[PDB]
Design a protein around this ligand. Structure first.
Ligand SMILES: O=C(O)c1ccc(Oc2cccc(COc3cccc(-c4c(C(=O)O)[nH]c5ccccc45)c3)c2)cc1
Ligand SMILES: O=C(O)c1ccc(Oc2cccc(COc3cccc(-c4c(C(=O)O)[nH]c5ccccc45)c3)c2)cc1
Ligand SMILES: O=C(O)c1ccc(Oc2cccc(COc3cccc(-c4c(C(=O)O)[nH]c5ccccc45)c3)c2)cc1
Ligand SMILES: O=C(O)c1ccc(Oc2cccc(COc3cccc(-c4c(C(=O)O)[nH]c5ccccc45)c3)c2)cc1
Ligand SMILES: O=C(O)c1ccc(Oc2cccc(COc3cccc(-c4c(C(=O)O)[nH]c5ccccc45)c3)c2)cc1
Ligand SMILES: O=C(O)c1ccc(Oc2cccc(COc3cccc(-c4c(C(=O)O)[nH]c5ccccc45)c3)c2)cc1
Ligand SMILES: O=C(O)c1ccc(Oc2cccc(COc3cccc(-c4c(C(=O)O)[nH]c5ccccc45)c3)c2)cc1
Ligand SMILES: O=C(O)c1ccc(Oc2cccc(COc3cccc(-c4c(C(=O)O)[nH]c5ccccc45)c3)c2)cc1
Ligand SMILES: [Cl-]
Ligand SMILES: [Cl-]
Ligand SMILES: [Cl-]
Ligand SMILES: [Cl-]
Lengths: 212, 212, 212, 212
């Protein structure tokens, strides 16, 4: 596509997109075009508005485009073209990516006892309500545990909420503790969001006992 | 995929899918699995049910799966595996395709006068509310008009309703009437549904006058 | 989207799209934009060309866009904007839909004997190499057989070729012949293409014997 | 979906997926099923193989599934079900995610001079050949620069190679340097892969002069 301003918009929240170059108040020669999950290719929106699109995205007095409550289908591209009172045309180009933050992740079915030298189920980490899916990962004593290295194995599951579309992730950790190791290790699980710069979320630790 | 029974399900209507081989009433060893626009790959549904899926698809006393109001995202594959009281396992495999019937098509901006030997805009046909999109076509004196043959031009547009997903189609017809032709031709437009065996819908005719 | 000329382009064949309004030969102020399965949103192509796109779509001396061999990923929208020597701007807007014609359909595993009053497997119809998928249907004595009416049942299967993407369809017909019926019925199967105005293809008939 | 082992497979490289529980050499009662970008829902692959799938994915003597050169369309789910010589059934479930590493990122059009207190174009960072797309970000003196905080502006562009599908990313940085700031700041750009635990790639720094 073209160069654009990246916009990250949280599901359910309003979004206001600026029409660069527009007169501050009507009358305004401006047009918005958007290609999102709602549209077949580009849809043009005008200041007068009208129709079912009024429920979804409407042009404000100052020419900005307003969505009262962003949803997954609003992901896409939003563009404005305006003329000011002199006649200079100005373009605005936005790439809108939608997200939701899940609840704090939780560990379920955690083991209280591990045996060294054999594979053990440590626990299952669960995260509910993310978009995009994101990923879960495990840590041992503040260091990331890497699947398929050093007796670590992980299995993963992804489900979607049937009405909201939001993701639930599950991650099952097994480890083979090394003989003569730490007898009270500390494990935890973290959720890493899909979009850049969004913060990770972490579970409470679990501290099994390891038997030599 | 595998062999399946094709099911066509109208948007907004209920759908009941039979679990072949299931005992007529509980207790029943049966499981439904579905992969639709709602799911990440396969989702398993059990007779006890539970959770958010209860709002969408639930197993009936006789083991059938019930959706109170089908939507676009229920398109996909629905399977049942049952054991009867003896131990015979029986599979059910359904490919569910969703549709909606648009309103009767309408011609707008129809021409009252055509000039022979030059291109004329005859009219614009509009169909609102279909799924899948379907197509519009034009007829002249009960015979199909073929675009880019014999001085016929057609342009087409597709839009989607922002909340329902249903399609609105527009088709603009231009013709160059042949000299010495019928002076009161009869044009009409038809909507052809996307799914097989669904009936076409037709507009009222228009009867312009052609000037030699 | 906007009004456009519909273009149907057969896979593997060349496609030439006209840039309306362009000067017949260089120099030409024209630009092509396309959004297809190959692109992230819109890609701009210029007369000078250059790069990997030269292998796929290149601007001709007369300003038309040339694709030497259309593929499934060329489905999408293709637009031109040209200025003539005076300064009139002219737009060209094309919606390109790709297709392939399968081989003639064939019936396999046809039954030689049917018993009246009980369900019988009549045969399996197979079509290989279509795009879009299209559909198969059955006929009895030159009339369409409707699944789930009058002792008819059909099961269907769709597969894709792993490298070409083209569809293979299979359709299994079972019928319960009515007692005292025609003792040498004639069945056949037809492939119906997905795009409008494309012709159906039909199998050779089969003529089982029916036993009262 | 179900619990699965996550597999990350580099485009163009071979992939071997183990059929857990299978006998070490024929005869083997095992079956692979896969749902990927190549398939319409599930495709079953058998030890005898055969057909066009032999070019893509074939079962080895030890029952593993072998793809000689993974492509984007092999993303998806791969399952095995085996019985050993005793009769024990064993399942294998793999979620295969494909990737490619881009070339080292490069800064182009870098500025030699910045003026403090006014917006300046610092440069454009480009990354070629990634899958999935991944993201670019900017750093100032070893700290991440956050768009739309403290006089920082970023615009982004994504394109796809028309034949390979791989992504090229561009990121244009503008900054308003703070008065009385460091007169020789150090900027750099980093590519962050889409999949977890894959390493970032970083550009050589640029060191413009800032004029008070
Ligand atoms: O679900 C729904 O129904 C729904 C959705 C969104 C929504 O919020 C809004 C979102 C955007 C904008 C607004 C104000 O728009 C207005 C109100 C009054 C005049 C105008 C308008 C102005 C001018 O602005 O003076 N110049 C114009 C020039 C040409 C044509 C129209 C205008 C715009 C309200 C409200 C309801
Ligand atoms: O911060 C920003 O907003 C921003 C960031 C980067 C940026 O680079 C670009 C420079 C030139 C072109 C482009 C893509 O084409 C664009 C972008 C925006 C509006 C339009 C546009 C055009 C028309 O042009 O025909 N008609 C329109 C009618 C209605 C609404 C929009 C348009 C086309 C992108 C432009 C703005
Ligand atoms: O507005 C909408 O679209 C919407 C409407 C309703 C809604 O909740 C439902 C969702 C799905 C299906 C249904 C009903 O089928 C149902 C639902 C629940 C139980 C039964 C049922 C009854 C009995 O009913 O006595 N005995 C049972 C015994 C065994 C198993 C089931 C039942 C039948 C209700 C969710 C959304
Ligand atoms: O009219 C019909 O319903 C019908 C039409 C054609 C037809 O051909 C087929 C024959 C065999 C297999 C298939 C696909 O696999 C299927 C089909 C249905 C259920 C299952 C299944 C299996 C499991 O098998 O492991 N576990 C399950 C657990 C829960 C729910 C379903 C299944 C697998 C299709 C079968 C039924
Ligand atoms: O796979 C591949 O590599 C491949 C793909 C497609 C292909 O066929 C073609 C497809 C389209 C066009 C052509 C001629 O283009 C040409 C040849 C010579 C000059 C120009 C050209 C002309 C002018 O035309 O005089 N004015 C121009 C004005 C500005 C910039 C360039 C030109 C165009 C060849 C050939 C190879
Ligand atoms: O037969 C036909 O070709 C045809 C059929 C219907 C038809 O209706 C339309 C009327 C107006 C607008 C539209 C969509 O927008 C279009 C259509 C075509 C080119 C452009 C365009 C614009 C720009 O406009 O900024 N810049 C461009 C730069 C490069 C290449 C194309 C464009 C925009 C469609 C137009 C032509
Ligand atoms: O350019 C490409 O991407 C491309 C490359 C190669 C190609 O054909 C192949 C496709 C998939 C896999 C392979 C090999 O694994 C294979 C293939 C065939 C047989 C065997 C094999 C051998 C034995 O080999 O002795 N004994 C066997 C005994 C039992 C089962 C298999 C084998 C191993 C070859 C298709 C495309
Ligand atoms: O490390 C691993 O491999 C692994 C990780 C997690 C894991 O959890 C699961 C436990 C049970 C079920 C599942 C999903 O269903 C699966 C998984 C694998 C094969 C099958 C399967 C079935 C059939 O079952 O009818 N027929 C088949 C025929 C051919 C090929 C595969 C199957 C079904 C997942 C299983 C294995
Ligand atoms: Cl799910
Ligand atoms: Cl639309
Ligand atoms: Cl397939
Ligand atoms: Cl692109």
């Amino acid at each position: 596509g073209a160069m654009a301003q990246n916009i990250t918009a949280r599901i359910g929240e309003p979004l206001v997109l600026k029409c660069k170059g527009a007169p501050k108040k009507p009358p305004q020669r401006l047009e918005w075009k958007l290609n999102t999950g709602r549209t077949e290719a580009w849809k043009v929106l005008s200041p007068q508005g009208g129709g079912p699109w009024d429920s979804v995205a409407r042009v404000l007095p100052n020419g900005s485009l307003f969505l009262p409550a962003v949803g997954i289908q609003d992901e896409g591209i939003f563009r404005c073209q305006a003329m000011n009172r002199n006649g200079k045309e100005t373009k605005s180009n936005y790439r809108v990516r939608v997200y939701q933050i899940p609840g704090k992740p939780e560990i379920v079915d955690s083991a209280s006892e591990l045996t060294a030298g054999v594979p053990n189920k440590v626990g299952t980490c669960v995260s509910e309500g993310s978009y995009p899916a994101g990923t879960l990962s495990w840590h041992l004593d503040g260091k990331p545990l890497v699947p398929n290295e050093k007796g670590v194995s992980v299995k993963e599951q992804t489900r979607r909420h049937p009405e909201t579309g939001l993701f639930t992730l599950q991650s099952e950790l097994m480890v083979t503790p090394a003989r003569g190791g730490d007898p009270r290790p500390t494990f935890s699980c973290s959720f890493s969001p899909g979009l850049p710069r969004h913060r990770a979320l972490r579970t409470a630790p679990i501290q099994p006992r390891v038997w030599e």
